[PDB]
Amino acid sequence: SDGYTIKPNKKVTYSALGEDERMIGFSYKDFGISSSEKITEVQVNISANKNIGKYVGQFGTSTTDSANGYWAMGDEITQSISGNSGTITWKVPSDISSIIQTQYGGEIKFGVWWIDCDEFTIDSVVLKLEH
Ligand SMILES: [Ca+2]
């Protein structure tokens, strides 16, 4: 396989999230990914009832590296979406992709630091693979 998709249909209200709630988690087991597979990109497809505007945020993931606390984050992303639907893409660095933990409850986390349109739906999350 070269990719896996989930369709969570998850409604998010940004202004309702507390400080400790601004990362939204998805368990890797929900995708059906094998531990032989290397993730190269993550895409989050979102939609709203009005033009979305700017998103600012970051992705995090469970890892197998205990020295760094079993956790890694990518760089900050700013993306502007001109219409009622769009895609936020994280190109996963090689040094993170090699240690992602898909087993034992590992998660991918979608951090929302700001979004102009307050209410949106996560329609799908897509993992693209290397091999
Ligand atoms: Ca953990």
Ligand SMILES: [Ca+2]
């Ligand atoms: Ca353990």
Ligand SMILES: [Ca+2]
């Ligand atoms: Ca600010």
